[PDB]
Amino acid sequence: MAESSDKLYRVEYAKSGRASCKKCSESIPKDSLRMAIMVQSPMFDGKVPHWYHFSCFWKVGHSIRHPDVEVDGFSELRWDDQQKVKKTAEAGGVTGKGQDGIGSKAEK
Numbered sequence: 001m002a003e004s005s006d007k008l009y010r011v012e013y014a015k016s017g018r019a020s021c022k023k024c025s026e027s028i029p030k031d032s033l034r035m036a037i038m039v040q041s042p043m044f045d046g047k048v049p050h051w052y053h054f055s056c057f058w059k060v061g062h063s064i065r066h067p068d069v070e071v072d073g074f075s076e077l078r079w080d081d082q083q084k085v086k087k088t089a090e091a092g093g094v095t096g097k098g099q100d101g102i103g104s105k106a107e108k
């Protein structure tokens with residue numbers, strides 16, 4: 001849509017293991033929660049997402065101050081994940097090792 005990437009931040013559930021972590025240099029599991037950052041591309045004519053694990057956003061260490069505005073894709077999350085993403089932004093981040101999965105079929 002118009003100005004779809006005029007944000008800083010993205011959050012969503014992972015449909016498949018096609019995204020890779022720009023922060024811890026591993027790959028992101030499917031049927032799990034992930035975040036990304038909106039950066040101006042050297043290779044593309046606009047803003048592009050830098051994907052990483054949900055905990056890895058808070059290892060990049062950015063603050064979020066109006067999360068339902070700044071975190072694109074938050075509208076697709078269910079209430080328990082919306083409450084946890086907003087609570088994590090109020091809490092100043094959560095930074096643990098996260099999932100044991102990496103992007104494979106039936107990895108849970």
Ligand SMILES: [Zn+2]
Pocket residue numbers: 021023024025026052053056
């Ligand atoms: Zn990671």
